[model samples]
Target: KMQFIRVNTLKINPEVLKKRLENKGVVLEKTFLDYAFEVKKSPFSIGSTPEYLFGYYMPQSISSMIPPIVLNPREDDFILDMCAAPGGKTTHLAQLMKNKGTIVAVEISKTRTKALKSNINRMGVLNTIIINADMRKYKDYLLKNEIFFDKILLDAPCSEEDIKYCSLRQKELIDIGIDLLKKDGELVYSTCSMEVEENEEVIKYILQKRNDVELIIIKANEFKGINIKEGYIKGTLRVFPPNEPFFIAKLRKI
Candidate 1:
């Protein structure tokens, strides 16, 4: 029932937005990510605020913010947001890139692309191009053109039912992700499902299939809590009962 926000630092200063929200009687708690805040209390819906309309901030799940940080995008980095839609992380990447780097956001569905476009424009993202394409084909397309990404993120599509299909789909995307990644580049794979079939097993699958990749140990031991479960592979972990839940793993292309 609570909300969290990542300040659109490309458009507004974190301290300035923090004070503005505080002046409105909203209680914001700090997280390890400097620009992120847990909305403890608010007079009304945080999304409906004037600041939100101005693209000064984005309402996001705390977990969504972490993947972009893990990717560690730079102003000159070429990043790909695979399966991007309703672009929470895409826009976050745009701002974190200081609206300077390129972010290619690809979504599978036209219907969902509308929401993605809306969020991207609403957040004043200038350096992003939205592509409506299946991510696998998109990877092939990029490969054909010799386009390689500095960082790639696949927040794979998953569901609460039939993890078998979900696992294969995730595996396919991660495989393509590794293919499109530049040497020494990073790729972050995350899912909303806690099933080992959907989470660690996918990492295992990738590790088995490729010799050029290795898990990057995520420095998140500080994120421990009763709601978190340790990942089978180091640097990959899950946070659940925390709203929608999440499993995130980072990999480096060696």
Candidate 2:
């Protein structure tokens, strides 16, 4: 994996972490997104550095950092982060809003949920509440209670399904997210998976099933897979290689 870290701005300034990392002869390259850097050079794995241990910065895939920015969190917005284990996007979302809003992070496993807690704590994220429960069940509970959110993020997993089940599973998850999303709310659906069934097809399913949701037109569309893709839809983006491979779609509820 390429070396990239998000400077945890909640606890320390980016410049401070950059200074410390640079002092050790590490060279960091800044990305289009603020607070993220590419460790182009390092004496050793930056993961072992004292600053990283203290949580001044965090190792996160550069592509993984994209969904939260597209979700465009506001301090007053209530957000849902599904499959939130490993806490990357959840922590990113919290720091983006400076911990002013609420993020209900759901993970299906107790062990994974605990791991999320550790990262949330380590990354100085205070605005998220982690829950060890299945999203399928929890989504219904929220729907039953008329609970809604200002935004939602579903960074759906791509493994285990081989191919068949991933699309079905993703449809179930995003359908619930759309129903619970407040009118005019946005949800970012992303995946590290390279499969078109997992990415484009899932988006197409949602579009065909509901007229209330529309593609929000991603400005980061320039990252579109070297040559490019998708005459199927205009605004969806695909990020690959030089960073981590990811397919990003931003949807807004009417």
Candidate 3:
């Protein structure tokens, strides 16, 4: 597998971390995306390195970084990370916010939430508050006086044994995310599944139900090999494997 590493700007500097990796015999090439590098070679195991242990760098799929970049979080904006667990993107969101805003990260699984907390702590993410609960239940749990999010990232479940159930769940999750977002706030939904039912169809479902939400066209120059499947939603992006196949769509509440 080709390794992709993101420099955690929260705890360490990207250029300094790159130099450290280079000195360790890791041949790195810049990805078109900022702060991300494609690992061409490594003399030492990536996980055992001091940088990885100190959370100076994190290994994540290049495709996974797209949604957060699309979300484009600001240092002072409140954001919601729906289904955030094993928190690769959650930490990225924190980094983007410069640990300056509130990030409500929801993870349903207890086991995964532990891992999520570990990553959050290691990456020096103080802006995030981890919530252990079904994302569907989150909005209801919040006080009525609580403010809505500026942006939401729902990295929905990608693989499923039942397409019907998966499609239903995706729409459900998107619905919940929409309800939680403020007016004009952006929500980026993504999945690893290639199924149209999960990708285009779910976006189509939301567009039909909510006239207030419109799909936002994602700009392409930031990353290479981002192919938008023709005749689908105009702004959505998909990176097909032997790269990690990911479908990402962004929408803004009008």
Candidate 4:
């Protein structure tokens, strides 16, 4: 795991943060870490948003938001949210894609899949096909359709280590969630954990198993304090949490 030091500040004005959040009915209670803003949005906000209601401004970290922006998805590429549920990134991707082409939202869990659908439907995200099945079998489905997605988002699952009371089951859930990306397609893998057993270990394993993929490091913002990964020279992105410990890794299928 990498250590995070805040070296630069974001260009976001405090007024802008307050106004944008308030527009979605979010209220800030306190702020910490230059990252966490204590918000009255949800007893469950846990460093994010209740985007299901807001329809547009979904709550995801600025660091995590960098991938789609980097990818420059076009208006017609088919994208896949491999472990999408409760639909945060899926919706953001749709926005990036301008609601055109297609976005396949896949989730394996029965209960969360319903929640994901509710969020997608409420957010008015068009051009989305929600699939309620294990992502491990996802590639087969694509083959069946005789289609290949232009991009695949593995947003690999993880325990809510960034949150106060996440359970071990969350990590197990993440383990089952990572095996769903298409070969040679872009994959954005992430976790809310700081432990090496969880973060680098899994990623290293994926690397050893598949030489076709590579990491995409997230660049530092105005804040010079973000975490710097050691020894990885390839292109990739990783988000290290400060107010809490979280991590993200992006890969491209070559």
> Which candidate leads the pack in TM-score?
3
Among these predicted structures, which one has the highest lDDT?
A: 1
lDDT of each: 0.83, 0.82, 0.82, 0.55
What's the true lDDT of residue 97 in model 2?
91
Q: Estimate each model's TM-score.
A: 0.90, 0.91, 0.91, 0.64
23, model 1: CA deviation in Å?
2.4
lDDT of 3 at 183: 92
List the RMSD of every prediction in angstroms: 3.1, 3.0, 2.9, 7.9
TM-score of 1: 0.90
Tens digit of per-residue lDDT, candidate 2, span 173-219: 88888998999989989888877678888899999999999988887
Give the residue spans of candidate 4 off by over 4 A. 1-56, 60-72, 159-184, 216-218, 221-238, 241-244
lDDT, candidate 3, residue 244?
Answer: 82
Model 3: residues with Cα > 4 Å off, grouped in runs = 143-145, 159-168, 225-231
**How far out, in Å, is residue 87 in model 3?**
0.4
Q: Encode model 3's per-residue lDDT on 1-254: one tens digit a residue.
A: 56889999888777888998899799989887668898889987888887888999889888888878888999999998877888999999999888998999987777778999999998888999999876655678653666588999988755232222323478888987888888989999987788768888889999998878999887666677444353267778777766688888899999
- What's the distance in Å from true for residue 72, model 4? 4.5
- lDDT tens per residue, model 4, 1-254: 22111111122334555566667675564322443344445444433444324443444554444444555567798777767776766766776676788988877776878988986776667879998875545556666776666676655445233221112233433333333445666655555555556566656766676556666655534324445343243433455544333455556666
Give candidate 3's error at residue 47 in angstroms.
Answer: 1.3
